[PDB]
Swiss-Prot record:
The modification N6-acetyllysine is found at residue 56. One of its GO terms (cellular component) is cell cortex. The gene is GRB2. The chain holds residues 54 to 154 of 217 of the full protein. Its main location: nucleus. The SH3 domains mediate interaction with RALGPS1 and SHB. Keywords: Acetylation, Cytoplasm, Endosome, Golgi apparatus, Host-virus interaction, Isopeptide bond, Nucleus, Phosphoprotein, Repeat, SH2 domain, SH3 domain, Ubl conjugation. It is found in: Nucleus; Cytoplasm; Endosome; Golgi apparatus. Ubiquitinated by RNF173, leading to proteasomal degradation and inhibition of the RAF/MEK/ERK pathway. In the nucleus, polyubiquitinated by RBBP6 at Lys-56 at DNA damage sites. GO terms for molecular function: ephrin receptor binding; epidermal growth factor receptor binding; guanyl-nucleotide exchange factor adaptor activity; identical protein binding; insulin receptor substrate binding; neurotrophin TRKA receptor binding; phosphotyrosine residue binding; protein kinase binding. There is a cross-link at residue 56 (Glycyl lysine isopeptide (Lys-Gly) (interchain with G-Cter in ubiquitin)). This is Growth factor receptor-bound protein 2.
Length: 101
C-alpha cells in the first residue's frame, strides 16, 4: 500500500510536535521528527493520554535504529514493530498514524 507515510514530519520543533499531537484524539498517535537538538538524529513523539512523550531514536556504528534493546534496519521497521508492542515501559502505548483534516 505504498503511499507517503503520514508519520514523517521532517524537521519540526519539539514544542510544535507537542502542539500537533496534543490535539490528536487517540492514544499512540505519533510522528517521527528530525531532532533540532541532535542533527542527523530522529525523535519519536507520541500522544499518551494527557500528554505527549518523546523517544530518542538511537543509532549505532552499523546505522541500526533502536529505542531500547531490540535493533531495527529502518525507521519504517522500528515504527511498525511498535504498532503491536508497547513503546512505553509503564503503559500500553501502541503507535497509530495521526489524523489529518
Ligand atoms: Ca479518530
Amino acid at each position: 500500500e505504498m503511499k507517503p507515510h503520514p508519520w514523517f514530519f521532517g524537521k519540526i520543533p519539539r514544542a510544535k510536535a507537542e502542539e500537533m499531537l496534543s490535539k490528536q484524539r487517540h492514544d499512540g498517535a505519533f510522528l517521527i521528527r528530525e531532532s533540532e537538538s541532535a542533527p542527523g538524529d530522529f525523535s519519536l513523539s507520541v500522544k499518551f493520554g494527557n500528554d505527549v512523550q518523546h523517544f530518542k531514536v538511537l543509532r549505532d556504528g552499523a546505522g541500526k535504529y533502536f529505542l531500547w534493546v531490540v535493533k531495527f534496519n529502518s525507521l519504517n521497521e522500528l515504527v511498525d514493530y511498535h504498532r503491536s508492542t508497547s513503546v512505553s515501559r509503564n503503559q500500553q502505548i501502541f503507535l497509530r498514524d495521526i489524523e489529518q483534516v
